[PDB]
Amino acid sequence: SQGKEGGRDTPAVKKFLETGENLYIDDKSCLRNGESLFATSCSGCHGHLAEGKLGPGLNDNYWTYPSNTTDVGLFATIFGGANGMMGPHNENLTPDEMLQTIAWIRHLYTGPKQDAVWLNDEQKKAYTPYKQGEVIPKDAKGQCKPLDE
Ligand code: HEM
Ligand SMILES: [Ca+2]
């Protein structure tokens, strides 16, 4: 909406614009939000688990546009999708919400650990193919304020 919030000046967005790093990767509070944001903005075409439906599966190691293997690339795709050639994507999420959504898409990954270029050395160590039924603890607290609270 608007009012008094953040969106484009949060520490995560600042860090992202400085190094391309997504501080929300593996942050449970951000993942909980991202799961919800992904649901209403992307799942309708990419599937509930990003397995693919009308749009391609975003949970595997094949990418039509490899730039999407980095969070900056994925971000640019949606924010600059405005009638282009990489899909029917419109900038509807704030920059901060986008990072949370991207963090969730990465969490939905089910492919080879070595192809997860969006994860650093440590995060790759903690990577595990997403399995349906998983439940992010609802009392999880982190860098992201719960969308419901
Ligand atoms: C913020 C929500 C969304 C995100 C993050 C998202 C992300 C992406 C990404 C990263 C790709 C490229 C995949 C690749 O390179 O292999 C893609 C492709 C595509 N998306 Fe989405 N998507 C979203 C919403 C939607 C919606 C709502 C629709 C339908 C109105 C849609 C339809 C498509 C289609 C048809 C393609 C394939 C386009 C092509 O191959 O050129 N997407 N999406
Ligand atoms: Ca894919």
UniProtKB/Swiss-Prot annotation:
One of its GO terms (molecular function) is iron ion binding. It is found in: Periplasm. Coiled coil: none annotated. GO terms for biological process: methanol metabolic process. One of its GO terms (cellular component) is periplasmic space. Keywords: Electron transport, Heme, Iron, Metal-binding, Methanol utilization, Periplasm, Signal, Transport. Binds 1 heme c group covalently per subunit. This is Cytochrome c-L. Heme c binds at C42, C45, H46. Electron acceptor for MDH. Acts in methanol oxidation. The keyword RNA-binding does not apply. The keyword Repressor does not apply. Disulfide bonds: none annotated.
